[PDB]
Symmetry: C2
Subunit: 71 residues, 2 copies
């Protein structure tokens, strides 16, 4: 208990959900009081998105509603 | 490339979002041709939920509204 950094130090301005495959969402923790939405591509990469952007809510919305139609 | 199992073999019938603090969305892969929604509790546990249940869509819907309300 000295110094802890948020999981996401930087941001990103993507893109289409077409490249995304895995979405990991973390709530408020002991290292970060701000919610950060991380994503992983199909190639095998991980980035950080800023909830502050409207387009961000769109690409993350499409992967949440689309993950219920395919049964 | 022989035999791969879905990330979620079983299901669950929870509960309240109050216990959930992390959401992981998995798409179609080489092990599963179906979308499965996994979650981790604040206690340090991981379960699998069945997207085929309506009540399941509720507890997972609430973690999206309350996870973006914090400014």
């Amino acid at each position: 208990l000295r110094e802890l950094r948020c999981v996401c130090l930087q941001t990103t301005q993507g893109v289409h959900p077409k490249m995304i495959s895995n979405l990991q969402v973390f709530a408020i923790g002991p290292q970060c009081s701000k919610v950060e939405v991380v994503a992983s591509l199909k190639n095998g990469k991980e980035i950080c998105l800023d909830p502050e952007a409207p387009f961000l809510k769109k690409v993350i919305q499409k992967i949440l509603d689309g993950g219920n139609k395919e049964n």
